Each structure stands twice: as structure tokens, then as C-alpha cells.
Amino acid sequence: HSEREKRVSNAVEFLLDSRVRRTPTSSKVHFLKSKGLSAEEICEAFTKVGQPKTLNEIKRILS
């Protein structure tokens, strides 16, 4: 796996956690950026767990 794939895979496992699911999107997005994910990678992770967010929303949170 590439380092990008590891970042996204780790983000997926994070977002699936039951306590994490109850945490607001904003906090999760900030946390995922702090682990080195780009806005596009964050967006990909949310879509892969069936919790899709627009890239615009993710960028708004991080701006």
C-alpha cells in the first residue's frame, strides 16, 4: 500500500468507530488533517464509509 492508501485506510477505520460516529464532522475533519490527510483524502474517506461530505464542506471546515 502507498502512504496515501495507508492514510485513507486509517481514516476509514477511525470514522467507523461507534464513538467517533457520534463526534461532529468538524472535529473529525480537523483530526484527520492533523494526521496528514489532504482535504481530498478526507473527502474520500468519508465517502468510503458511506458518510459522504462535499469537498466544499471539508474545505469550509479547514479554512
Residues forming the site for Cl ion (CB under 5 A): 26
Which of the listed partners (Cl ion, ligand KZZ, none) does 58 bind, with a CB threshold of 5 to 8 Å by partner kind?
none
Contacts with ligand KZZ in 8-47 (CB under 6 A)? Answer: 10-11, 13-14, 17, 19-20, 23, 27-28, 31-32, 35-36
Beta carbons within 10 angstroms of residue 24's beta carbon:
9
The contacts of residue 32 (CB under 8 Å, 6+ apart) are 11, 14, 41, 42, 45
- How far apart, in whole angstroms, are the C-alpha atoms of residue 28 and residue 24? 7
Q: Which residues bind ligand KZZ (CB under 6 A)?
A: 7, 10-11, 13-14, 17, 19-20, 23, 27-28, 31-32, 35-36
